[PDB]
Amino acid sequence: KKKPQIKYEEKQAVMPESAAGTYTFEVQTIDGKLDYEPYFTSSTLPWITGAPTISSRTDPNKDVISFTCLKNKTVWNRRAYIKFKDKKTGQYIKGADGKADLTVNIIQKKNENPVVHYKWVDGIGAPTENQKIKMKIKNNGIETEDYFTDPFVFKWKETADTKFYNVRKLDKLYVQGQFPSNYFVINGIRNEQIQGRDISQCWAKTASNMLHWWFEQNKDYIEQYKQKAAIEEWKRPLYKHDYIRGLQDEDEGKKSNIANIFRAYSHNNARGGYIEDGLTWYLYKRDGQKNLGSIYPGLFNDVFAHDTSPINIERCETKKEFEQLMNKTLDNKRAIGIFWQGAQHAVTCWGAAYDEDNNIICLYIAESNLPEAVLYPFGVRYKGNIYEEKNRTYMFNYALSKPENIYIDGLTTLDKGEDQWKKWLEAHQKGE
Ligand SMILES: [Cl-]
Ligand SMILES: [Cl-]
Numbered sequence: 457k458k459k460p461q462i463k464y465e466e467k468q469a470v471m472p473e474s475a476a477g478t479y480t481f482e483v484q485t486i487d488g489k490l491d492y493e494p495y496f497t498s499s500t501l502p503w504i505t506g507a508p509t510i511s512s513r514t515d516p517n518k519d520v521i522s523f524t525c526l527k528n529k530t531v532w533n534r535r536a537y538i539k540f541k542d543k544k545t546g547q548y549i550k551g552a553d554g555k556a557d558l559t560v561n562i563i564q565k566k567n568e569n570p571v572v573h574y575k576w577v578d579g580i581g582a583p584t585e586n587q588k589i590k591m592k593i594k595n596n597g598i599e600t601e602d603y604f605t606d607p608f609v610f611k612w613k614e615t616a617d618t619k620f621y622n623v624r625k626l627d628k629l630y631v632q633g634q635f636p637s638n639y640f641v642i643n644g645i646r647n648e649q650i651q652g653r654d655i656s657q658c659w660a661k662t663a664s665n666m667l668h669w670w671f672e673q674n675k676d677y678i679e680q681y682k683q684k685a686a687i688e689e690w691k692r693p694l695y696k697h698d699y700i701r702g703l704q705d706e707d708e709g710k711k712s713n714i715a716n717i718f719r720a721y722s723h724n725n726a727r728g729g730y731i732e733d734g735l736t737w738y739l740y741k742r743d744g745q746k747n748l749g750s751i752y753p754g755l756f757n758d759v760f761a762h763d764t765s766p767i768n769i770e771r772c773e774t775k776k777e778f779e780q781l782m783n784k785t786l787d788n789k790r791a792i793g794i795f796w797q798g799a800q801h802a803v804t805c806w807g808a809a810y811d812e813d814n815n816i817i818c819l820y821i822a823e824s825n826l827p828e829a830v831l832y833p834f835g836v837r838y839k840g841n842i843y844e845e846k847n848r849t850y851m852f853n854y855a856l857s858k859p860e861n862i863y864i865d866g867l868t869t870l871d872k873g874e875d876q877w878k879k880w881l882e883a884h885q886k887g888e
Pocket of ligand 2: 578579580581582
């Protein structure tokens with residue numbers, strides 16, 4: 457009397473649709489019906505209801521195995537694995553090579569009609585349908601005829617009516633032999649003429665974007681500061697922000713006073729810099745930033761001197777860390793710099809897309825290296841099995857063929873600093 461066996465073609469994954477339901481696959485039963493039990497290799501997966509079962513043995517050549525899935529609301533495939541235990545010997549049944557355990561790969565397909573919602577940084581409004589620009593798929597830099605069709609894949613075009621900031625690197629926009637020869641000339645504080653270059657100033661572009669937002673959100677406090685504080689003479693022109701929308705690429709040097717300050721007076725170290733250094737430099741006096749540039753604005757030093765800094769630096773390396781930190785930042789009305797080592801790189805993030813499970817699926821990025829006057833979408837993905845594992849967050853550039861995985865190291869955030877402003881104002885009215 458031979459011992460029965462079971463076989464399965466492991467080259468074949470079992471791929472149920474995204475819909476909820478009880479799905480099946482077949483296992484071939486050789487020389488009779490082996491007494492075994494199927495098991496998921498992880499029992500704690502929330503999108504599978506219970507253990508798999510043998511739902512039919514009536515065909516002498518095959519068993520039917522059933523398992524039940526919840527609907528996959530996410531835009532990602534999700535994976536599970538079934539192994540088989542010999543009920544008499546207690547051993548796992550072997551696969552075709554006689555060495556590895558027989559393992560059936562389950563991959564539930566992604567939701568093709570997801571309901572997406574969005575969260576934007578406080579105070580910048582939100583894109584209208586006319587401001588959302590769909591994107592073509594590229595192959596080795598050449599655009600194809602196809603488009604990315606996921607609803608969250610769009611560029612947020614800058615118009616006269618939009619309220620985000622995206623200062624771009626002149627050194628990248630510059631077209632040698634087409635742009636004017638005075639393209640990099642800045643009129644400085646003492647009206648001196650300066651040729652400012654910014655090829656490695658992504659930390660400063662991100663800082664400038666966040667400071668434009670901060671000056672706008674705190675416009676009224678800043679007006680009271682100019683009326684009430686004893687302003688240092690040389691700093692008087694710096695107590696405003698100008699960001700002029702609708703300029704051609706050739707006029708980018710005339711677009712932003714804050715960006716121009718960094719470009720005229722800070723540094724362009726090829727190694728890079730840090731978002732938080734540029735933010736501190738602009739806002740209050742700290743010894744670490746003493747030699748960041750040839751001047752030190754430190755414009756509101758007596759508002760933030762001996763109190764909470766509105767600047768924070770937070771690291772993330774798991775999916776849970778990334779989502780908690782993004783949600784905390786967005787829900788607390790703060791602006792967002794994203795950094796990573798790769799040289800230290802930096803971009804600005806103005807919002808995020810979410811699926812119906814509230815996973816973050818896309819970020820909307822001001823990328824000072826990219827040419828268009830838009831925010832670009834960066835898809836968000838996580839290493840490994842998000843249902844089991846830390847799941848290192850990473851993002852990627854939809855605008856590129858074969859985008860490199862960008863492992864986010866952390867966020868640098870800028871708070872409005874309302875309590876510090878109120879205390880400064882209250883202290884003034886008390887000294888009346
Ligand atoms: Cl199980
Ligand atoms: Cl708003």
